[PDB]
Design a protein around this ligand. Structure first.
Ligand code: 5K3
Ligand code: 5K3
Lengths: 115, 115
């Protein structure tokens, strides 16, 4: 509360560490469905169904331009990518499996890096 | 943003300074309408009309028990006292004038102490 602070966790390296993690995401062989925005003009249903589209290039732009106020907002956007993927794609599809693989991949790097 | 911090204003004395200011509020001769909660069982209209009743003793209790997360939440409750007073009392009444005097009194101590 007022004049009562929790010990401040060191966050000075978060920007660099999230960038590193995103780089490993981008270079994963199953990253291809998530590198660019889904094309809203060509994919039926997607614009109406997926209220908040997200992808790695958009996350990269936001990270590079100071649009994540903290660790958690970055993680929320990464998870949003995979939540969207689950909403729109069957689990037993190439893209569906990609999403599951990438989410697993992310959450490990996230745990290892910050926990 | 992430790993980009504004210079941190020193807030370690805020709890003590707000306590000092509240003490001067409490000891002001026109503080008497605001020292204790308005009696909701005896004052017609007050419970229905005034959605968030506030008074100095309640503010004192909240301050002493770590219920203000920061400077501003404390100031919001003090102002709430006088906003309520304006809502319920005519300007040309003893209590009405008291409220105006106390608000002026507070805002000066607030400006002088933290600005
Ligand atoms: C993250 O990528 C997408 O969700 C792809 C959605 C999609 C599925 C099948 C198609 O033929 C076209 C687009
Ligand atoms: C902050 O004190 C109050 O607003 C008092 C409201 C009130 C006005 C006249 C009365 O006869 C009783 C209560």
């Amino acid at each position: 509360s007022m004049s009562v602070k929790k010990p401040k966790r060191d966050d000075s390296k978060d920007l660099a560490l999230c960038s590193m993690i995103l780089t490993e995401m981008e270079t994963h062989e199953d990253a291809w469905p998530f590198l660019l925005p889904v094309n809203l003009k060509l994919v039926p249903g997607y614009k109406k169904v997926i209220k908040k589209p997200m992808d790695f290039s958009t996350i990269r732009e936001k990270l590079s331009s100071g649009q994540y106020p903290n660790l958690e907002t970055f993680a929320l956007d990464v998870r949003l990518v995979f939540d969207n993927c689950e909403t729109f794609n069957e689990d037993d599809s190439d893209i569906g499996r990609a999403g599951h693989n990438m989410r697993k991949y992310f959450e490990k790097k996230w745990t290892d890096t910050f926990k």
